[PDB]
Swiss-Prot record, chains A, B:
Name this polypeptide is given: Protease
Domain of life of the organism encoding this protein: Viruses
Residue ranges of the region described as Dimerization of protease: 1-5, 49-55, 88-99
Active-site residues, record numbering mapped to chain: 25 (for protease activity)
Length: 99, 99
């Protein structure tokens, strides 16, 4: 699809069996999702942006379906105010910025 | 251009005669740049990012060049980790997300 940016580029994602809304975010390095349980091992990480840092759990090799497209990669889980699909998974679905 | 996301989508901007690096950020509503002097009056604004809220200075109708495309619009000035070009100016230069 071609998504204009008049509004927030929100899409539906499926992760851990759950449906969620998420923002497509070229300004983010790693995908960050609101608190949920995921399978497998994790390790702690701090990630930072405007307003400072939050502590997250880093899970590797997690599958997410993004707007109908399957991608696999690292997912961070913690108290983010919005679900963010970042460049680590946007590359996998072939997403580009065009102007 | 067509910009892939394997690396940070950094571009050169020109504001007040000065070149700076900025990140093209579809996950941002308004454009935020590190402290610098801009002409005219400013209005208060709070913006909420990943780690909480911060106060910035809002300047309206600022001329900015972005990767060679001219935009004129609202620029926020405050303690951001990196200069971010958000959807309010990405729409002015005709940017879209594609996959
Ligand atoms: C500041 C950027 C360098 C990085 N951020 C991604 C960015 O797109 C966030 C994504 C975002 C979006 C909503 C809330 C929090 C974070 N947008 C943002 O902070 O925009 C602020 C300015 O315009 C406003 O509209 C959105 C909030 C304001 S970040 O959320 O802090 C972040 C940092 C590291 C990772 N791995 C994932 C995300
Ligand atoms: Cl990854
Ligand atoms: Cl103030
Ligand atoms: Na894992």
């Amino acid at each position: 699809p071609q998504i204009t940016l008049w509004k927030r580029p929100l899409v539906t994602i499926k992760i851990g069996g759950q449906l969620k809304e998420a923002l497509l975010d070229t300004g983010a390095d790693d995908t960050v999702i609101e608190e949920m349980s995921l399978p497998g091992r994790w390790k702690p990480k701090m990630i930072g942006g405007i307003g400072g840092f939050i502590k997250v759990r880093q899970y590797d090799q997690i599958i997410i379906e993004i707007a109908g497209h399957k991608a696999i990669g690292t997912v961070l889980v913690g108290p983010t105010p919005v679900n963010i699909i970042a460049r680590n998974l946007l590359t996998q679905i072939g997403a580009t910025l065009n102007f």
